[PDB]
Enzyme design. Structure first.
Site: not given
Ligand SMILES: O=C(/C=C/c1ccc(O)cc1)O[C@@H]1O[C@H](CO)[C@@H](O)[C@H](O)[C@H]1O
Ligand SMILES: *Cc1c(COP(=O)(O)O)cnc(C)c1O
Ligand SMILES: O=C(/C=C/c1ccc(O)cc1)O[C@@H]1O[C@H](CO)[C@@H](O)[C@H](O)[C@H]1O
Ligand SMILES: O=c1[nH]cnc2c1ncn2[C@@H]1O[C@H](COP(=O)(O)O)[C@@H](O)[C@H]1O
Ligand SMILES: O=c1[nH]cnc2c1ncn2[C@@H]1O[C@H](COP(=O)(O)O)[C@@H](O)[C@H]1O
Ligand SMILES: *Cc1c(COP(=O)(O)O)cnc(C)c1O
Lengths: 810, 810
Positions: B351, B542-543, B548, B650, B654
């Protein structure tokens, strides 16, 4: 099956089966293909629980509308046992459920055995609270039990190599279908902080908050459609608690530890901070609830007309200064008015005179944890001692004796003195105990305020302790005198008319024999131990304590063994001697006593010359559900505390109701049991209280008894020399040294009379007709010992409310 | 009401009302006189839950009987959000429940807002797992989600004085009606201990045991009567744990801490022991379940024909050595056979390529906690490197690069290398990302085993992300093309026929306006913030992460503010700029970015010359339930990561499905979204990956941009001099210093093109017809981004199973 279990009507049975199947599918999310007995137990429990809710809602609504005086029973312990059967009994559903389950291909008795005991108590005090809840509901009182929802109750006892091992009682592992969480009614409880004095009075500030989340359990009365509430508090951290991040979340555990575990001391005081937190936690949450209900019925003059608070020992004693704190600091009542209200609201029950059981909290603990309460306690003390000084001018030693504050290396607060000062009624739990309170430990207080001091002899509920546990006996009684006795136990006196009735005699003996067979079968199945069901079942079950003198029983057992070995070909009445009970984990001597009992068994039970004439069995994990099995099977009830030490006893009453004869000292309620039955129908022995006092005056010298009684000397030599511990000859040295030099309970002083009395028991057992006639005379005079009688007395003489056997509409 | 919400038949509505009342009385033990909205929510939830159970039982029985290949989706995160509405949607109960509640005098939308999010994830990875579960059920796959039941999910974010504060997410406080505890299926998990080598092989001994108790949650497919299971494990102490007495009971907490709290890092690696315990805990419990189900369907040759295990990132990577441990140590398979089975069973999804997110566990931690697994990892490594040496003889640096063991001051295990070695398929999550994996970080591995490497572009479920959150849009689509698109999203291409239809144009614009009004109302009600609903809603949710580039958005906002102040009487298209997201508690810069956003707001929102032409709002506590509200209201979706950093995204999908236009870089799935819609229908700007590479080659000098762009210099001077922090002039010094000297993400390099692109957005928004026509072209080409498409590809190309839209019988 049997009439006292109610009717199994076609429509009822049909509906029960339908709802059982509904719960299996929707509630448990199981199909019958993979359902286990535990799943079937839960389906039945949910089915029965459904029958409570209408009555529960209707009862509480009724109290809201009619606004009766409310009774709050505050206890740190509620020893409830299992709920399923009791619920069926009180709702007249037992036969219908039996038939419903039978038609589904299930054995209801098997399902009942799956339920965990709610073991939220240690012994007598906790079980009294449970019997009292049942009686309050049966007598239609607007009563609430308030306590703590311990995650872990009294430990499960395992015996390993003859020693007690403790295992956590994870009683909530599979869920508790009886309780309803009420997170919406969560309340804050404060700890630590400091007191600021302002123009507007004292303020308690900078506190740490723990949340008290209530869980409600229904308490059904006997066939009157009354369902009262037991509300137990669980500790929760506030959401901003500590709020690196992960550690702050983990540290929520510290707050939640308040409700984690029941302190496992019976009749002993351990001054630990966590115990004090538990005590305040229950009090603070409960009092908020009480005040809320009062306000929704500013005028507190009516508070004692609408509220009674009964303190089960000193454990919830902080209710007294907490009520004062709320009334003075928050409601802004003047001190004198607040105090009048408090005294009229609170009443205190004492359960023991043993000094080591009395709560004496170090001032430094209270100063840190509860600084405002300590201030209030000092003010209570100063005003109380001013009254003493006016009544007894110049009596400076009386002022020292009566003070709530005890001087020494460590200043302590005597919580019993607080309870007496702050209550309108103080009671003991049997006539002899109540008299002892007035003559000894509370003599000074009785002299100041004689009107405060009462007796309320204990009792047991005849629903759990006859109808539930001994349906065979309940039925043969009902056949002669009908069913009214179940809620009017004095009707058992009618059985005296049947003492010469040959049919009743054979039926009483038949029921006992059946119970003995059933118990013998239970022992073989669950513990692979074989017993002789034709032997006299000699039973001592209760917590292990020096004052209860399991050791005196041990000496008798060894005496019997030695007599057999000396004269192997002489006939003796066969006995199975059963001893059971838990020791507090930190109580070394009690743990040694358990080891001695198992060690005696190891010798006696494997000696081929003894054969089946004598067996000694340690009953593992004694608890309410085991009491329900062993008590109906007993022939002889051992109630052998040193005179003046057992405040009442309640096990004694259970045995009497279930057709055992009693061997006992004139202690606690034994005195009243003998009075009711006639002394000729009781096996009384040993020193009276007056005799114990005379020995204390000249000084107890155990050596004298050793020197004068050859049979006793033999036993002590056997213990000392390693006869009962060949691999560890000195194993029992601590027991021997205690008996010879440091015995507070005078075991040797009652040995000769005990053995002689036991000989009379054996002689009577050889004549089954006369044994059974004496049993009838005991059962018939058991009526006084119903907790319904006890509660009626609390209601009329302390709480100022009238009981009722009137039914609410279903 | 609206057709896509189903039928409200008289018999259905009648039954729902009956069961609602039944649950209020029997389940909740409330009368209507004192019931609150929360009680009504629970009554409705239990009513709807009842409709799942028959289907749930029947589905699992069907899998037992038919024995399909089973898919196990292992994730440390499942970001589920609320369940009530989703359940009604998938069971076609929404209109019936709406009517039922309306007839009872209740507003169902009000009740829906009471439900807590199941916030058991951080962001995209956790939410992908949730969308995937929905799609697997809808496509009739025998699929199981396995994870951890965290007591506390992602923290609740509060903003105080413009700063993020964290509060524990006590999501279980009121209970969870969706889950079913299965304490009967509790399994042991082992930790610590040591390895003994015997004649019969290795033995892992002297371990500490934690119990894994499963909770099952139903996962309904869309109107096909399939209900799959999500099984989440909770940690429990064994009953002999530590077994003074009180402390031993309290210390049970230590074991139970494993499942207490979700680690709140998005796209970052924290090598803490407790996290490693969580990872092994999930793996060990899950694998036992997998093996049990396989054995009840000794021959493991068929194991990969019956089992697929998908690893959601490296977090459950210990599945690889655990499967080996079970097969070799317990089942006594030879190593080579066990390895063949393992590789054929496991597949790994990556990811992110950011190095700080990669799991590299110190060997010393593994040696202590999991000594047998470490041995197995070393053996895997030696055999793998032997293969590399045979394929690339003499290439010693390749051996160092590819090793599972990384050398340094602290030896570490590279979990990604473990996953590649031990899996038959490795995929990225969008085309550009998958290509980056093969060209950069996993180039060596691709060269050895090119067949392993795949792409599976991410997707989102159109049930939650269109039908549930935007019923107005779903309905106007359904009116034109019917309802089949809800489970066949490619049918949206039919909407291209309506791009010149005046009625469809007005209806699309109408739905957006309604959603904007509703959202504006929500903001006023819950947060007392007023916004202009005629303004362009410019949204970045987003986070909070440097990659970002919320900071790039900030620079644009300040640019707009400065332009207004310079020419106050010039018309500009009004904007409401909304930014939301949580920062990881330990991530200083992210916390500073939140503070900057709120500080910009404080200035912009109170400047009387700006008026309602520009508003900057920080959306507090961004979570799944807030995404469902804000996404349907958005006009412009900000997807502005530095090219090469966002693996997919993702949120982007949306927004596209819900009628927002996108401003973005050619990063992640943005590339594919632009391809589907046409680049003319997307606002693309900035450096491509190749351009970022060229800048890295000569070296990024932020000073150059500062020196050449006057508008940018002004902003930096404003930040530095205290314009946005008058009381603390140096507050933002760390941000300025980062941008000028240590910016990994090249914010300044994309500033000019971003501002120019934003000007084109404003120009188009001034022409509502042409804006809406472009929106239609986006919605119409969204179909590829259904998670149904994604899952069909995993099924056919990785798992070897065929999807089905066939209905099970109800
Ligand atoms: O959300 C994460 C990573 C999470 C995580 C990592 C390390 C930890 O320790 C805990 C959580 O990556 C995201 O995974 C999403 C779905 O494919 C992608 O759409 C995003 O581009 C990507 O940044
Ligand atoms: C979809 C979603 C994300 C992922 O958003 P990105 O813009 O792809 O990082 C994060 N948090 C919530 C609550 C979501 O619904
Ligand atoms: O059971 C207890 C005392 C419990 C306790 C004390 C101190 C703690 O800290 C915890 C429990 O006393 C018993 O209370 C019973 C009911 O009246 C009596 O019948 C017994 O005679 C008496 O010993
Ligand atoms: O404000 C009220 N209105 C109506 N009924 C109430 C109210 N307060 C309490 N009750 C009733 O009294 C019951 C017991 O409430 P409690 O005594 O406060 O726990 C409730 O469940 C209601 O049936
Ligand atoms: O031994 C069995 N007999 C009958 N049904 C079974 C058995 N094992 C599993 N099942 C069915 O399969 C379902 C799912 O079981 P699981 O897959 O082991 O969780 C069960 O609820 C049953 O319906
Ligand atoms: C009745 C009872 C007690 C009290 O017995 P005593 O002999 O009065 O001490 C203790 N434990 C259990 C389980 C009981 O049922």
């Amino acid at each position: 099956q049997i009439s006292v279990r109610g009717l199994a009507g076609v429509e009822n049975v049909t509906e029960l089966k339908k709802n059982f199947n509904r719960h299996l599918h929707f509630t448990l999310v199981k199909d019958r293909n993979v359902a286990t007995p535990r799943d079937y137990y839960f389906a039945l429990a949910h089915t029965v629980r459904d029958h409570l809710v209408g009555r529960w809602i209707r009862t509480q609504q009724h109290y809201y509308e009619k606004d009766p005086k409310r009774i709050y029973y505050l206890s740190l312990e509620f020893y409830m046992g299992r709920t399923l059967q009791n619920t069926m009994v009180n709702l007249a559903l037992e036969n219908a459920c039996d038939e419903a389950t039978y038609q589904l291909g299930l054995d209801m008795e098997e399902l009942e055995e799956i339920e965990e005991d709610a073991g939220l108590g240690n012994g007598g005090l906790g079980r009294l609270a449970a019997c009292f809840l049942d009686s309050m509901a049966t007598l239609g009182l607007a009563a609430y039990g308030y306590g703590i929802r311990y995650e872990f109750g009294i430990f499960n006892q395992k015996i390993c190599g003859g020693w007690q091992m403790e295992e956590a009682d994870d009683w909530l592992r599979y869920g508790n279908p009886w309780e309803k969480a009420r997170p919406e009614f969560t309340l804050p409880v404060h700890f630590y902080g400091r007191v600021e004095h302002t123009s507007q009075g004292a303020k308690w500030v900078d506190t740490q908050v723990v949340l008290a989340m209530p869980y409600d359990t229904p308490v059904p009365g006997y066939r009157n459609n009354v369902v009262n509430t037991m509300r137990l508090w669980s500790a929760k951290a506030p959401n901003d608690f500590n709020l690196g991040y992960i550690q702050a979340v983990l540290d929520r555990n510290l707050a939640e530890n308040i409700s984690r575990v029941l302190y496992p001391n019976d009749n002993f005081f351990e001054g630990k901070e966590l115990r004090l937190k538990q005590e305040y936690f229950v009090v603070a949450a409960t009092l908020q609830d009480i005040i809320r209900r009062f306000k929704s019925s500013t005028n507190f003059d009516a508070f004692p007309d609408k509220v009674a608070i009964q303190l089960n020992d000193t454990h919830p004693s902080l209710a007294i200064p907490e009520l004062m704190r709320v009334l003075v600091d928050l409601e802004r009542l003047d001190w004198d008015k607040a105090w009048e209200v408090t005294v009229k609201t609170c009443a205190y029950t004492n359960h023991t005179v043993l000094p080591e059981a009395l709560e004496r909290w170090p001032v430094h603990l209270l100063e840190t944890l509860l600084p405002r309460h300590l201030q209030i306690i000092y003010e209570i003390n100063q005003r109380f001692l001013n009254r003493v000084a006016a009544a007894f001018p110049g009596d400076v030693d009386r002022l020292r004796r009566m003070s709530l504050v005890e001087e020494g290396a460590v200043k302590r607060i005597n919580m019993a003195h607080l309870c007496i000062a702050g209550s309108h009624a103080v009671n003991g739990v049997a006539r002899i105990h109540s008299e002892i309170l007035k003559k000894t430990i509370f003599k000074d207080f009785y002299e100041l305020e004689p009107h405060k001091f009462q007796n309320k002899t204990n009792g047991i509920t005849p629903r759990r302790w006859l109808v539930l546990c001994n349906p065979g006996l309940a039925e043969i009684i009902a056949e002669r005198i009908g069913e009214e006795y179940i809620s009017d136990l004095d009707q058992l006196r009618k059985l005296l008319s049947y003492v010469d009735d040959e049919a009743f005699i054979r039926d009483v003996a038949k029921v006992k024999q059946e119970n003995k067979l059933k118990f013998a079968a239970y022992l073989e199945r669950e513990y692979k131990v074989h017993i002789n069901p034709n032997s006299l079942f000699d039973v001592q079950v209760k917590r292990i304590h020096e004052y209860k003198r399991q050791l005196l029983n041990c000496l008798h057992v060894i005496t019997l063994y030695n007599r057999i070995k000396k004269e192997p070909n002489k006939f003796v009445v066969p006995r199975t001697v059963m001893i059971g009970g838990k020791a507090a984990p930190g109580y070394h001597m009690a743990k040694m006593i358990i080891k001695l009992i198992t060690a005696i068994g190891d010798v006696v039970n494997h000696d081929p010359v003894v054969g089946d004439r004598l067996r000694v069995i340690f009953l593992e994990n004694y608890r309410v559900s085991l009491a329900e099995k062993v008590i109906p099977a007993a022939d002889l009830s051992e109630q052998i505390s040193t005179a003046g030490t057992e405040a009442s006893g309640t096990g004694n009453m259970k045995f009497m109701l279930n057709g055992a004869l009693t061997i006992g000292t004139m202690d606690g309620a034994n005195v009243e049991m003998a009075e009711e039955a006639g002394e000729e129908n009781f096996f009384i022995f040993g020193m009276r209280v007056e005799d114990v006092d005379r020995l204390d005056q000249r000084g107890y010298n155990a050596q004298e008894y050793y020197d004068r009684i050859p049979e006793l000397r033999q036993i002590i030599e056997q213990l000392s020399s390693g006869f009962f511990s060949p691999k560890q000859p000195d194993l029992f040295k601590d027991i021997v040294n205690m008996l010879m030099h440091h015995d507070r309970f005078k075991v040797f002083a009652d040995y000769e009379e005990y053995v002689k009395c036991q000989e009379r028991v054996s002689a009577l057992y050889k004549n089954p007709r006369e044994w059974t006639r004496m049993v009838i005379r005991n059962i018939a005079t058991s009526g006084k010992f119903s907790s319904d009688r006890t509660i009626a007395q609390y209601a009329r003489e302390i709480w100022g409310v009238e009981p009722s056997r009137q039914r609410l509409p279903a």
